[PDB]
């Protein structure tokens, strides 16, 4: 920091994971714009990358952009714990992974597919649009 | 045109329904010693000074 004038390579709008990001917000908060990332995950991701966290996102050079990317598709091997992941024990792999924008839709949409054929109580209520938890519905949530 | 000010000599108690307004007997310390009457809203006590935008008006 102490950066007044814009870097010659300062990029005003950034595109990643098919998502576009601004170049005036701080880095750790900008990355929150993606699906599968938050504040807690991000810092633990940048920091492993020897990246600074209080730098405006547009001034992120190209070399950092990749290493940041590398530690994001390869989290575990880079050290980060298994309790900081959005997917801990996959149903098929049995693994611990962290999935992103292209995947959230499929892993979720595929989950309900498994519940309809399995006929669980939960799956049916996902169909008529009720509440899966045990919330009372007599007098609340009236469309 | 130039509002003057008058001093309170006494008080004649609440009159208006729901309280509030109070009749008063004032005089002009402008030097004419004109003892008259007026109505006032808000707590007021003896020696208080009022600002009268009227050199002349009467109530009762």
């Amino acid at each position: 920091m102490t950066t007044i004038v814009q870097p010659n390579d300062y990029r005003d709008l950034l595109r990643m994971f098919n998502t576009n990001i601004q170049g005036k917000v701080v880095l750790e908060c900008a990355l929150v714009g993606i699906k599968g990332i938050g504040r807690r995950f991000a810092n633990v991701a940048l920091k492993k990358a020897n990246i600074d966290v209080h730098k405006r996102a547009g001034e992120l050079t190209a070399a950092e952009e990749d290493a940041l990317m590398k530690v994001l598709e390869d989290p575990l091997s880079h050290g980060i714990p298994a309790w900081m992941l959005n997917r801990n024990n996959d149903f098929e792999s049995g693994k611990d992974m962290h999935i992103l924008v292209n995947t959230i839709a499929s892993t979720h949409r595929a989950d309900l597919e498994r519940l309809r054929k399995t006929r669980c109580e939960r799956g049916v209520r996902h169909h008529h649009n009720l509440k899966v938890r045990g919330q009372h519905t007599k007098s609340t949530g009236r469309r | 045109p130039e509002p003057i000010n008058a001093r309170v000599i006494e008080v004649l108690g609440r009159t208006s329904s729901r309280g509030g307004i109070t009749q008063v007997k004032v005089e002009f310390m402008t030097g004419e010693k004109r003892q008259i009457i007026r109505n006032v809203i808000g707590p007021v006590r003896k020696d208080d000074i009022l600002v009268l935008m009227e050199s002349e008006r009467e109530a009762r």
Partner: protein, 137 residues
């Protein structure tokens, strides 16, 4: 003495001294923790460990001969939980960090155990007073 100076100056000065003297070292787990269930995100500063250590040793000095346990230190670093469409409530901090700090200090003999908990040792008092007078001016 030590209480004739505000804590803010003493804490930071001592933490800098400590980091310079290698007396204690940040372990690995100091870089993904949130410091307490109450807290919402992780700390911004990269050297909070040393600040916490300085504060803890100052707390051990204040109590003098009296004893302190770890869980009693966690209740001096509590906060307020929020974000639950429910009235707020108070929660205790985490004790793994505190345990690490006290264990490291004890390994340096600045901190002698007793029947319950631990209490300052005269060497620790010596050092704390020395730095207190060093910063006195």
């Amino acid at each position: 003495s030590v209480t004739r100076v505000p804590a803010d100056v003493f804490i930071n000065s001592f933490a800098a001294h400590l980091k310079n003297r290698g007396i204690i070292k940040c372990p690995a787990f100091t870089d993904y923790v949130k410091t307490g269930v109450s807290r919402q995100y992780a700390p911004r500063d990269a050297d909070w460990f040393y600040i916490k250590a300085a504060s803890v040793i100052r707390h051990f000095y204040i109590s003098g001969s009296h004893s302190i346990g770890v869980a009693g230190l966690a209740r001096k670093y509590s906060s307020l939980q929020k974000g639950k469409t429910t009235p707020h409530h108070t929660k205790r901090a985490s004790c793994k960090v505190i345990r690490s700090i006290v264990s490291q200090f004890l390994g340096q003999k600045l901190l002698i155990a007793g029947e319950r908990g631990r209490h300052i040792s005269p060497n620790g008092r010596k050092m704390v007073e020395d730095f207190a007078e060093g910063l006195q001016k």
